[PDB]
């Protein structure tokens, strides 16, 4: 049972949605799936809310899914609005954004430590394993769904793909992250581990998982040049650390290439990368 906010109450504490950056004085924060996140303050707390914009059943799919998943590495739902048809999400506002701003040092912020990075990629590998064991498949693992808190500490977000455990139609996710199977129509809890893979990649070399002026576009096509013998993981990893040391970075890119195996069968359950991770340091 979550808070139901009034819609007006949202619409005043965002100074009416307000669509102009944090930056020029407005509350735009950034954007999810189909909403767009505003930085409030509701009772004393700084809060996010998610105005969305059929998308009403992932609306509740993210409700739902947050009543029964409660974990220090998942964000917290606080409350929801929903008056007609423009409906609310409200969170704790997670001041460090998200793993993908950070790793892009978006808006001036300093890069991640080598250990703050290992911390993030154990407390993400701990949030998609409380998702399994509670047979949650995610479909939208991404650095851009992975918030950051107070401490750094990393938190799944985004769960209006989220399905209780395959085939379907209507294929969802980010096509750079994706498992093959999952672009061809699959719904399993592998695919999760290929995506994180995938997130595991951007923590180490830094770089997002596509960019349309870089050879090659797609990060996972790094793992083929490296075992192609073409390049090495030092090549690729993040200039912007000082405390990477060879050893862990290596231990990190094999869980990586583990996870990102074609095969769905030959990839490891999350037990077994938190195990990894967890051996790592
Ligand atoms: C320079 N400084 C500027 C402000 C920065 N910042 C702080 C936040 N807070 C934030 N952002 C969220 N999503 C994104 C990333 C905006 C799109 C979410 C979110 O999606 N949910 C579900 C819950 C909480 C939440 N909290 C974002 N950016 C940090 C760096």
């Given at each position: 049972?979550?808070?139901?906010?009034?819609?007006?109450?949202?619409?005043?504490?965002?100074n009416n949605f307000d669509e102009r950056p944090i930056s020029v004085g407005g509350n735009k924060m950034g954007e999810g799936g189909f909403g767009v996140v505003?930085?409030?303050?509701?009772?004393?707390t700084t809060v996010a809310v998610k105005k969305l914009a059929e998308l009403k059943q992932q609306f509740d799919q993210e409700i739902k899914?947050?009543?029964?998943?409660?974990?220090?590495?998942?964000?917290?739902?606080?409350?929801?609005?929903?008056?007609?048809?423009d409906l609310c999400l409200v969170y704790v506002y997670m001041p460090n954004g998200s793993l993908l701003d950070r790793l892009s040092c978006l808006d001036?912020?300093?890069p991640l430590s080598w250990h703050m990075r290992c911390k993030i990629a154990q407390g993400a590998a701990n949030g998609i394993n409380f998702l399994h064991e509670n047979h949650?498949?995610?479909?939208?693992?991404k650095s851009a769904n992975i918030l950051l808190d107070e401490a750094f500490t990393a938190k799944i977000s985004?769960?209006?793909?989220?399905?209780?455990?395959?085939?379907?139609?209507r294929i969802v996710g980010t096509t750079a992250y994706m498992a093959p199977e999952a672009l061809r129509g699959e719904?399993?809890?592998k695919s999760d581990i290929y995506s994180f893979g995938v997130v595991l990649l951007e923590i180490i070399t830094g770089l997002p998982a596509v960019d349309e002026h870089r050879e090659p576009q797609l990060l996972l096509d790094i793992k083929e040049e490296i075992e192609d013998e073409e390049k090495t993981?030092?090549?690729?990893?993040?200039?912007?650390?000082?405390?990477?040391?060879?050893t862990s970075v290596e231990a990190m890119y094999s869980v990586a290439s583990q996870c990102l195996h074609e095969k769905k069968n030959k990839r490891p359950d999350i037990k077994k990368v938190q195990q990894l991770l967890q051996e790592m340091t």
């Amino acid at each position: 049972r979550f808070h139901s906010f009034s819609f007006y109450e949202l619409k005043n504490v965002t100074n009416n949605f307000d669509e102009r950056p944090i930056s020029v004085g407005g509350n735009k924060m950034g954007e999810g799936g189909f909403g767009v996140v505003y930085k409030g303050y509701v009772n004393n707390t700084t809060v996010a809310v998610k105005k969305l914009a059929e998308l009403k059943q992932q609306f509740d799919q993210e409700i739902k899914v947050m009543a029964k998943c409660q974990h220090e590495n998942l964000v917290e739902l606080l409350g929801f609005s929903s008056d007609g048809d423009d409906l609310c999400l409200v969170y704790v506002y997670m001041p460090n954004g998200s793993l993908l701003d950070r790793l892009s040092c978006l808006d001036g912020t300093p890069p991640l430590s080598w250990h703050m990075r290992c911390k993030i990629a154990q407390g993400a590998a701990n949030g998609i394993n409380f998702l399994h064991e509670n047979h949650h498949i995610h479909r939208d693992i991404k650095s851009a769904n992975i918030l950051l808190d107070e401490a750094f500490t990393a938190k799944i977000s985004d769960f209006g793909l989220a399905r209780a455990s395959v085939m379907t139609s209507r294929i969802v996710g980010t096509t750079a992250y994706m498992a093959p199977e999952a672009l061809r129509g699959e719904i399993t809890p592998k695919s999760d581990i290929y995506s994180f893979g995938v997130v595991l990649l951007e923590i180490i070399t830094g770089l997002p998982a596509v960019d349309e002026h870089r050879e090659p576009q797609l990060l996972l096509d790094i793992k083929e040049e490296i075992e192609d013998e073409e390049k090495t993981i030092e090549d690729y990893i993040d200039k912007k650390m000082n405390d990477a040391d060879s050893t862990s970075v290596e231990a990190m890119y094999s869980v990586a290439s583990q996870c990102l195996h074609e095969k769905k069968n030959k990839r490891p359950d999350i037990k077994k990368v938190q195990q990894l991770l967890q051996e790592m340091t």
